[PDB]
């Protein structure tokens, strides 16, 4: 073992007393030891004729592996069996026997959800203790709350079974969209209701010890000026008529370079695919043209945004890569036309990407900050957060594409090194290297994310700069810093309540939400037995019929018959995953000319090698009327759904 902190004992104390409790402690103060202590006490509290059974809930695989290894290494010596079940090792194994024959079971929540729904696990009465890692996710349709729905449904019912103690683990419970303290109080009470918690454990009598371990990094706010247009009066006309040669085909009833323009191009593109035409032959031409036009427009928009947030050079390289991929996917008259127009004006560019006269002031401010902090301390470890995955290697190539930052060794963390560039890590996650500097490049999320991000630099002297060219970001961070105060104050206020009163308010909210969920069930579909024709979305070619489509596990959708096999092509999948009882063998694209529109994937399901498609790649025409309707999700498309039968 190892000598623990006092605030750890303090945090684990309400849990060891057998009370369902939510533990709220700063990120990286060692919640793992708290879990181990709670589990140890809970397991070794039982008599000889009875035995306990603990279940742990990690939301992601790294935490799964880590916690499993630690728990197994620590508790085996005590004579307790520790195991784990994730999606990889969940198939073709009796999970009920795995649960029964073990004392500690580390799970991803989806496993327990699926097994409860299926029936392999009768009730939650099997466990004597449930622990939720990052219990702030216990809300809405998240698997955690899906479990707690079962828990409460058993609790709030005549059917009485020994329900397990519930422990939550987090650094922030959240406040929702609360404008004041009394609303945040209601939010926290609602969460405690969702977790059936009667206690909220925080550090109080040992704060002086805790604050010598986890240091809050100072948060500097860097508001910079925007660019002042070497890439604005060039792609403008390009966008103008690349929209209007699409208007050459038909008239269609909004500033450029924004997200609204993105939404506009998207909905327009999703409104062009339904242009019914008696010619049909040239309907394909029209749709395949307009699709290309819009697909070029939106990526032009992407280039504009990337330029607006990063180097203009990367804004070019983006489009160059795009047209490269377009030329690699087969040459079309339209595609080679737009490409010709692009490369005609490309000579004017590149040279513009080569002037220091037009350099993003944001990147110059970032260069200033980095140079300063690495001058004051060369052994600085910096972590950087960006909005999109496009800006990652953009800022990377910006770093090594600069002699001023020759002291930097960029690293990537998306789906040894001085600085690590990343998108956005979910929750605390597996602990990485400790950083002395945290930079937020136009990146601001929720309050919980803000509080959790402090774990990146919980050492003394750690700093955090928020670099942006927008005020809305700044205010969006300030409101979070206020929300934290609201949360802490609401919690400290709730900790003054009597346990019973709190319990009955919780029970009240629980009964309320239960009634809501019960009455929420509704007569949703009247299945249309009419056979519908599924066409392609790009070239409008006939893909299949609804009569040929089979549904697997009430989630996935395949196509039968040898007719469809001559309608698609396939290339080996880039990231061959393994989901459920499936296995991604390859990808599936259209076959009509070199359309090559993505239709779905080709999988190996048991002893079958079958195509699985997504409805958001097809247009649902009616064989009778002709009304071409669109569906973004399969569950939105209600038709005669026939379960997949191996008899075929």
Partner RNA sequence: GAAUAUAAUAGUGAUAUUAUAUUC
Residue 283 touches which member of ligand M7G, a copy of itself, Zn ion, none, C-beta under 5-8 Å by kind: none
Q: Is 28 annotated as a binding residue?
A: yes
Q: Is 595 annotated as a binding residue?
A: yes
Can you give the binding site for ligand M7G, defined by CB under 6 A? 574, 584, 601
Where does this chain touch RNA (CB under 7 A) — which range of 55-63, 204-212, 374-382, 453-461?
A: 55-63
DSSP codes of every residue in 349-381 = SSSGGG-SSS--HHHHHHHHHHHHHHHH-TT--
Q: Least CB distance from residue 45 to RNA, whole Å? A: 25
Q: Is 539 annotated as a binding residue?
A: yes
C-beta of 458 vs 540, nearer to a copy of itself? 458
- With CB atoms as reference, the residue minimizing the distance to ligand M7G is 601
Q: Using DSSP, state whether 119 is helix, strand or coil.
A: coil
Give the per-residue contact string, 551-590, with Mg ion (x = CB under 5 A; - = no).
Answer: ----x------------------------x----------
CB contact at 8 A, 371 and 405: yes
Angle at 194 between CA 25 and CA 197, to 5 degrees: 55
Q: Is 299 annotated as a binding residue?
A: no
Q: Using DSSP, state whether 244 is helix, strand or coil.
A: helix
C-beta of 53 vs 584, nearer to ligand M7G? 584
Binding to RNA (CB under 7 A) within 102-141 occurs at 108-111, 114, 137, 139-141
Element housing 643 (H / E): strand 642-643
C-beta of 1 vs 574, nearer to ligand M7G? 574
Residue 503 touches which member of Zn ion, Mg ion, ligand M7G, none, C-beta under 5-8 Å by kind: none
CA nearest 85: which of 75, 77, 67, 70? 67
Q: Least CB distance from residue 10 to a copy of itself, whole Å? A: 17
Q: Is 387 in the site for RNA (CB under 7 A)?
A: yes
| Helix/strand number for the chain, H first, E second | 18, 23
Contacts of 373 (CB under 8 A, 6+ apart): 380, 382, 436, 437, 463
Where does this chain touch Zn ion (CB under 5 A) — which range of 147-155, 229-237, 473-481, 590-598?
A: 590-598
Polymer length in residues for the chain: 648
Binding to Mg ion (CB under 5 A) within 497-556 occurs at 555
- Packed helices 499-520 and 181-194: angle between N→C axes, nearest 10 degrees: 70
Residues contacting RNA: total by CB under 7 A = 63
Q: Is 31 annotated as a binding residue?
A: yes
Element housing 609 (H / E): strand 608-613
Q: Is 222 in the site for Zn ion (CB under 5 A)?
A: no
Element housing 347 (H / E): none
Q: Is 258 annotated as a binding residue?
A: no
Residue 40 φ/ψ, nearest 5 degrees: -60, -50
- b/e per residue 504-517 (b: at least 16 CB within 10 A): ebbbebbeebbeee
Instruction: Work out which of 312, 536, 544, 603 binds Zn ion, going by CB under 5 A.
Output: 536
Instruction: Work out which of 451, 469, 600, 610 binds RNA, going by CB under 7 A.
Output: 600
Rounded Cα gap, residues 296 and 299, in angstroms: 5
C-beta of 375 vs 417, nearer to a copy of itself? 375
C-beta of 28 vs 143, nearer to RNA? 143
Rounded Cα gap, residues 71 and 81, in angstroms: 9
Q: Least CB distance from residue 544 to Zn ion, whole Å? A: 12
Beta-carbon count within 10 A of 475 CB: 11
CA nearest 395: which of 309, 302, 298? 309
Q: Is 29 annotated as a binding residue?
A: yes
Residue 536 touches which member of RNA, Mg ion, Zn ion, none, C-beta under 5-8 Å by kind: Zn ion
Rounded Cα gap, residues 102 and 128, in angstroms: 12
Q: Is 278 annotated as a binding residue?
A: no
C-beta of 325 vs 607, nearer to Mg ion? 607
Binding to RNA (CB under 7 A) within 415-444 occurs at 415, 423-426, 444
| Sign of the dihedral defined by the CA atoms of residues 427, 428, 432, 438, in that order | positive
Q: Is 288 in the site for Zn ion (CB under 5 A)?
A: no
Beta-carbon count within 10 A of 196 CB: 22
Residue 574 touches which member of ligand M7G, Zn ion, RNA, none, C-beta under 5-8 Å by kind: ligand M7G
Residue where the block lists tokens 């198939």: 91
Element housing 601 (H / E): strand 598-605
Residue 485 touches which member of a copy of itself, Zn ion, RNA, none, C-beta under 5-8 Å by kind: a copy of itself
Instruction: Work out which of 96, 186, 209, 262 binds RNA, going by CB under 7 A.
Output: 262
Q: Is 616 in the site for RNA (CB under 7 A)?
A: yes
Beta-carbon count within 10 A of 372 CB: 10
CB contact at 8 A, 184 and 175: yes
Going by the annotation, the residues of the binding site for ATP are 25-32
Residues that bind Mg ion (CB under 5 A): 555, 580
Q: Under the rule (CB under 7 A), what is the footprint of RNA?
A: 59-62, 86-88, 90, 108-111, 114, 137, 139-143, 259-260, 262-263, 266-267, 387-390, 414-415, 423-426, 444-446, 449, 472, 476, 555-557, 577, 579-580, 582, 584, 587, 598, 600-601, 612-616, 632-636
């Amino acid at each position: 073992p190892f000598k623990p902190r006092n605030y750890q004992l303090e945090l684990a104390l309400p849990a060891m007393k057998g009370k369902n409790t939510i533990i709220c402690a700063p990120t990286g103060c060692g919640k793992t030891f708290v879990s181990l202590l709670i589990c140890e006490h809970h397991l070794k509290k039982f008599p000889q004729g009875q035995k306990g059974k603990v279940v742990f809930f990690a939301n992601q695989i790294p935490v799964y592996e880590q916690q499993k290894s630690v728990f197994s290494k620590y508790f085996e010596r005590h004579g307790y069996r520790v195991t784990g079940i994730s999606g990889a090792t969940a198939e073709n194994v009796p999970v009920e026997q795995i649960v029964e024959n073990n004392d500690i079971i580390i799970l991803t929540p989806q496993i327990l959800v699926n097994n409860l729904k299926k029936g392999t696990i009768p009730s939650l009465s099997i466990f004597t203790l449930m622990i939720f890692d990052e219990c702030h996710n216990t809300s809405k349709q998240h698997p955690y709350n899906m479990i707690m729905f079962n828990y409460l449904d058993q609790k709030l019912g005549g059917s009485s079974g020994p329900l397990p103690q519930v422990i939550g683990l987090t650094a922030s419970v959240g406040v929702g969209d609360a404008k004041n303290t009394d609303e945040a109080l209601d939010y926290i009470c609602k969460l405690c209701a969702s977790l059936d918690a009667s206690v909220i454990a925080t550090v109080k009598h040992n704060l002086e010890e805790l604050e010598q371990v986890v240091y809050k990094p100072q948060k500097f706010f860097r508001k910079v000026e925007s660019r002042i247009d070497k890439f604005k009066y060039i792609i403008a006309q390009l966008m103008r008529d690349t929209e209007s040669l699409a208007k050459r085909i038909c008239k269609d009833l909004r500033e450029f370079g924004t997200q609204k323009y993105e939404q506009w191009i998207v909905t327009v593109q999703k409104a062009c695919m339904v242009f019914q035409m008696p010619d049909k032959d040239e309907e394909s031409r029209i749709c395949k043209a307009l699709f290309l036009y819009t697909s070029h427009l939106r990526k032009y928009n992407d280039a504009l945004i990337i330029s607006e947030h990063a180097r203009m050079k990367d804004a070019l390289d983006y489009l160059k890569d795009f047209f490269s991929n377009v030329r690699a996917a087969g040459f079309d008259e339209i595609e080679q036309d737009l490409t010709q127009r692009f490369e005609e004006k490309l000579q004017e560019l590149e040279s513009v990407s080569r002037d220091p006269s037009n350099e993003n002031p944001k990147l110059e401010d970032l260069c200033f900050i980095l140079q300063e902090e690495y001058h004051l301390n060369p052994e600085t470890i910096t972590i950087l957060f960006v909005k999109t995955r496009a800006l990652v290697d953009a800022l990377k190539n910006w770093i090594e594409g600069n002699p001023k930052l020759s002291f930097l060794k960029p690293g990537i963390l998306t789906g040894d090194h001085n600085i690590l560039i990343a998108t956005s890590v979910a929750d605390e996650g597996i602990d990485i290297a400790q950083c002395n500097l945290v930079i937020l490049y136009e990146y601001v999320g929720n309050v919980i994310k803000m509080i959790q991000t402090r774990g990146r630099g919980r050492a003394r002297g750690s700093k955090c700069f928020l670099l942006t060219s927008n005020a809305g970001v700044i205010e969006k961070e300030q409101i979070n810093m206020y929300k934290e105060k609201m949360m802490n104050d609401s919690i400290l206020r709730l900790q003054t309540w009597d346990e019973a009163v709190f319990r009955e308010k919780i029970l009240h909210i629980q009964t309320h939400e239960k009634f809501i969920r019960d009455s929420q069930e509704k007569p949703k579909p009247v299945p249309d037995k009419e056979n519908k024709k599924l066409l392609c979305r790009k070239c409008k070619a006939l893909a299949c019929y609804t009569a040929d489509v089979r549904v697997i596990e009430e989630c996935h959708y395949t196509v039968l018959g040898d007719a469809f096999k001559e309608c698609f092509v396939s290339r080996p999948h880039p990231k061959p995953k393994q989901f459920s009882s499936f296995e991604k063998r390859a990808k599936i694209f259209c076959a009509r000319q070199n359309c090559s529109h993505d239709w779905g994937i080709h999988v190996k399901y048991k002893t079958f090698e079958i195509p699985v498609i997504k409805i958001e790649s097809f247009v649902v025409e009616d064989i009778a009327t002709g009304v071409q309707t669109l569906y973004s999700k399969w569950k939105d498309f209600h038709f005669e759904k026939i379960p997949f039968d191996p008899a075929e």
